[PDB]
Design a protein around this ligand. Structure first.
Ligand SMILES: CC(=O)N[C@@H]1[C@@H](O)[C@H](O)[C@@H](CO)O[C@@H]1O
Ligand SMILES: *[C@@H]1O[C@H](CO)[C@@H](O)[C@H](O)[C@H]1NC(C)=O
Ligand SMILES: *[C@@H]1O[C@H](CO)[C@@H](O)[C@H](O)[C@H]1NC(C)=O
Ligand SMILES: *[C@@H]1O[C@H](CO)[C@@H](O)[C@H](O)[C@H]1NC(C)=O
Ligand SMILES: *[C@@H]1O[C@H](CO)[C@@H](O)[C@H](O)[C@H]1NC(C)=O
Ligand SMILES: *[C@@H]1O[C@H](CO)[C@@H](O)[C@H](O)[C@H]1NC(C)=O
Ligand SMILES: *[C@@H]1O[C@H](CO)[C@@H](O)[C@H](O)[C@H]1NC(C)=O
Ligand SMILES: *[C@H]1O[C@H](CO)[C@@H](O)[C@H](O)[C@H]1NC(C)=O
Lengths: 588, 588
């Protein structure tokens, strides 16, 4: 195909000082970020407090710290008795904030500039921040992955902590799981409502050539009553899990390590159309992004046979929810409990169950925005974080073989380059909130001052969020409900006033013979090939996989033959552009 | 660990004109190379002829062509009726040469400048040169993977073409096999002799996350009589196959695609100690080298259960050779014929079944030479061809965690850069024979004119084949029986006359202010970090992953401040070296 999976532009963000990003007073190793779409406030739980950020549109942003210290039993022999706020959820009672509280998990409520404690609440926050925690809210129910006690066993479980009855996953359903994400899926009838959650676990296949871990999606019935026996009453009786596969067909490249998940509801309102985007990596830290539909996952769960069970399944099929608050029959539960893994794998959406794309970058988080271009065309744009603390903006492919993912840009969003610890996409304000151990940054999705290059450079960027107008490249959500934006196919520059690009400004230099010199051409587009030409002969050529950001022609001891005009030309596809034009004139 | 898996030096071979390599008269796409260790002759089968190369030590080499034209029925409607020589084997009767002969497989005997035809001999040569062929000779028995007829099925087989009776492998033992290499293995008793062969085939595992092909080693009893029934008489009744695994422990990295195998008998003469070196790649064309022992492979074959078979095995065990020419019992053959894969995998030798090393290069062939250093120490040196037409010389690791494979050098052995078609190591003459589509080249295993960093460079090379003597870096097999060679541990330069390296020659240059300029430092050692220093500060730093071969410090418009000394210093581990020394003097 085409290696356009690399960022085309290494953006340089010239924002509006004091408006785009704010630092914490100190360094916060463990954090959590909360932000509701549309709001101008951003909450961050840190060490012994919760930062309140304000990002007023078009105006300077600021902080505000609300200390909620470990003041509930300070430790003698001070070591690490901080109160890391690891949770921030908004309830009708206000903003719930839970923290470790010197190994005494508790929660507080923030309503009106108030800090009302609710005391110890196990299962709402770990005993240590560096733990693989997870809690989900739905109505007056809460599900958690956090142990309720410290001397608890070494078996992580998914539990309903608040609700009709407390339920926990049994010892046979997972093997050293690492939870990623969890959601509620509302099916056709309310009693069929499922809870899905994604995680990684040990591979049941212990052969030496099998990868150590595998990726999964598990389902549970929201209205699971519990089992019939005294031992099965308090356990989930509707568990089932499936393997998630993200592999390229053309090549035999597999990405088994699921890193992050992002759900995107379809404009149709149909739950089956909800998209599950997953970022996967492999032993080399290369990644791929696969997309699954809730409909496919559910179909697998209700028709696939179970691994290791070779006989007709019980009437109430394992995993199937039951109508009128009926508990799962023992016979049905025992099959499920012994054979929790379905046999068929969950593969990506549509024909050719292949990834949207893959690359040699190490991606950790993903967020997606379905959006409309100036001309009404709909595009899905993915935002990925690398383990190098940067963000990639990729346009998802559409039609067929002619369409591929297009990595339009990479950006380093912080004042101080660092690892990205959290990321949240606000599709309402069209902003991307990212944070590190030092600051919090608000990155616009419609950032286009980055594409220079006149009108051609603007449309050649392929960024669906912008177009050319009033002599500049600006956001389509700007004001004037109309801008010159391009057409998908090759040569998207055709719609500019000048059918052909601007010539480079002529640069002159006078040099004596035998002198040592060099000509540098900074390569803006990383998809282009750059050539230095003299007397119609290419003297130097720099291809897209070029490490240095400049294509340099070295002139050793200048000879008479090497006097004159030197052009550095850029060629992407069938597009050509004069990037540099020098003239070496004799002067001794 | 350490990434010393990349070549430390890109050798530049200045040999002896007319002595090192000879071209064919024309271009040969399909070739075979024969060469008996110690000989000065190299035979190469090609299109309609066989080449006779002569590589007289210390003297110019030459060619000689012996046309064996398709003169045995020239085709009407000429297309591709050549007689590609695909086999060269010397027997007591003389040099056996077999070819395609216009889709009419035949052999010829070359005794004393004569070309005696033996006529059509199916199984000795394919019908087309691009076919996956394999023929093995042992005593008066010949084995082959080549079909005997052109209208034959789509099932490749391993057959005994010459011997007491013809035996062929059944339809059930392999699925689209691609043969790599075969060998006879003499065990304790003659009747236990085995034939082992390596190959790739389809993965029986059809799950979407499973890789498409897998690597195997198969075993057959040389003394196999056949079966007991009319249908099994002519079939091999002792076939068993096992998956060959080459995966890294630390990382989870798997290399499932076997590319080439090389056998190295132990000095002890113990078959069980024979080493099997396999080169493996993966979907990304990255590679690793794993080592196995005939002992470990045999233990797997006689002790492992069979995949898919869960009952006590038959008394005479599947794959076990029988004493007095007894045919394999039907009850034994049927278990084997239905379950030919043993369940346990063959893993690398020694504790921590891991590769000797892996790198991001795409290796295709391997040869190993056990050698002794000047001080009697023994090292195993690997010779690997990349798919870029180069050879890598790696030194196998020894002791423990402190020892790692060391890639000491890369070399382009041809006058014309091309893909390496064949490679054969002659431990007798200490040479490596490599061929392409245009030439054949003899490469010394003891090449050291390549290391030129004075005494220190020579020892810093870690190349066990050489040391410093008579004011130069030379081969330990040269003459004086005694040279100054280094010590395995860090800082192997210590044993040189001057305890510390030679300062770099001073270079002066006069320039006027505001003049543009640059300093280039060719980076010889690819394992060192190079730094340009001025006024005690580094202005430019180049780390090992540096693409270009030069560390360049750029000087825009020269200023008064930036006048003076400039040093380019290289530093591998705890070793320093002045690679360049410039002094910019003022002059207008
Ligand atoms: C040279 C060779 O045979 N290596 C192959 C190459 O053809 C292909 O381009 C590459 C892509 O990963 O896979 C490997
Ligand atoms: C925003 O912060 C900047 C600090 O760089 C400050 O100069 C400016 O006054 C603030 N914005 C305004 C105009 O209030
Ligand atoms: C916030 O304060 C207002 C007025 O003081 C009060 O009416 C309201 O109940 C408070 N919020 C909650 C839910 O405690
Ligand atoms: C699989 O990966 C997880 C998380 O990366 C790790 O905790 C676990 O130990 C790994 N499995 C094994 C046994 O190596
Ligand atoms: C990427 O993978 C490597 C192993 O190949 C690992 O050591 C490294 O930590 C990973 N990158 C990061 C920093 O997450
Ligand atoms: C060996 O070949 C080279 C180049 O073909 C030639 O210059 C040289 O004279 C030859 N050696 C002799 C002494 O014939
Ligand atoms: C070739 O040499 C062998 C052994 O020296 C001899 O038997 C044979 O006759 C020779 N070939 C011919 C036909 O001269
Ligand atoms: C497995 O891979 C090999 C080599 O890459 C290829 O020749 C073979 O056709 C593949 N197997 C199948 C049937 O796809």
């Amino acid at each position: 195909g085409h290696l356009r999976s690399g960022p085309r532009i290494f953006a340089v963000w010239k924002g509006h000082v004091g408006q785009d990003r704010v630092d914490f007073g100190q360094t916060e190793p463990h954090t959590v970020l909360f932000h509701e779409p549309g709001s101008s406030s951003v909450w961050v739980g840190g060490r012994g407090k919760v930062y309140l950020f304000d990002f007023p549109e078009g105006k300077n942003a600021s902080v505000r710290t609300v200390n909620i210290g470990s003041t509930k039993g300070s430790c003698l022999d001070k070591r690490d008795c901080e109160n890391y706020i690891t949770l921030l959820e908004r309830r009708s009672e206000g903003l719930l904030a839970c923290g470790t509280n010197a190994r005494h998990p508790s929660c507080w409520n923030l309503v009106n500039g108030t800090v009302v404690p609710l005391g110890e609440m196990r299962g709402y926050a770990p005993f240590s921040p560096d733990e693989n925690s997870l809690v989900l809210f739905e109505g007056d129910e809460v599900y958690s992955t956090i142990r309720k006690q410290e001397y608890n066993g070494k078996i992580p479980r998914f539990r309903r902590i608040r609700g009709e009855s407390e339920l926990y996953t049994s010892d046979t359903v997972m093997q050293n799981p690492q939870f990623i994400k969890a959601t509620i899926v509302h099916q056709d009838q309310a009693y069929d409502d499922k809870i899905y959650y994604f995680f990684r676990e040990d591979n049941p296949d212990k052969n030496p050539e099998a990868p150590l871990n595998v990726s999964r999606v598990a389902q549970l019935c929201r209205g699971d009553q519990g089992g019939e026996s005294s031992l099965s009453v308090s356990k989930w009786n509707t568990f089932l899990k499936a393997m998630l596969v993200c592999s390229d067909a053309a090549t035999n490249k597999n990405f088994n390590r699921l890193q992050d998940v992002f759900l995107l509801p379809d404009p149709s309102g149909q739950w089956r159309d909800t998209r599950v985007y997953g970022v996967f990596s492999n032993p080399w830290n290369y990644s791929a992004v696969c997309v699954y539909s809730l409909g496919d996952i559910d179909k697998v769960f209700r028709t696939s046979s179970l691994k290791g069970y070779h006989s007709s399944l019980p009437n109430p099929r394992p995993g199937k929810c039951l109508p009128d608050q009926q508990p799962i029959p023992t016979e049905t539960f025992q099959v499920a409990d012994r054979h929790p893994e379905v046999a068929q794998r969950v593969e990506p959406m549509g024909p050719l169950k292949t990834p949207l794309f893959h690359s040699k970058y190490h991606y950790q988080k993903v967020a997606v925005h379905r959006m409309q271009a100036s001309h009404g065309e709909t595009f899905h744009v993915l935002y990925l974080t690398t383990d190098r603390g940067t963000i990639h903006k990729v346009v998802e492919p559409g039609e067929q073989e002619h369409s591929f993912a297009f990595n339009i840009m990479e950006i380093q969003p912080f004042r101080r380059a660092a690892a990205i610890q959290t990321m949240s996409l606000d599709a309402e304000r069209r902003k991307l909130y990212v944070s590190s151990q030092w600051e919090v940054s608000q990155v616009p999705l419609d950032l286009c001052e980055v594409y220079g290059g006149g009108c051609h450079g603007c449309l050649m960027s392929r960024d669906p969020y912008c177009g050319w107008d009033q002599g500049r490249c600006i956001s389509i959500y700007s004001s004037e409900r109309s801008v010159l934006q391009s057409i998908n196919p090759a040569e998207p520059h055709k719609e500019c006033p000048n059918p052909k690009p601007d010539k480079a400004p002529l640069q002159k230099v006078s040099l004596a013979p035998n002198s040592r010199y060099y000509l540098s051409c900074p390569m803006e587009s990383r998809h282009a090939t750059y050539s230095w030409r003299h007397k119609e002969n290419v003297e130097q050529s720099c291809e897209p996989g070029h490490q240095s950001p400049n294509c340099i022609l070295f002139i050793e001891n200048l000879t008479a033959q090497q006097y004159g005009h030197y052009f550095c030309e850029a060629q992407e596809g069938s597009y050509f552009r004069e990037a540099q034009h020098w003239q070496l004139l004799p002067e001794d």
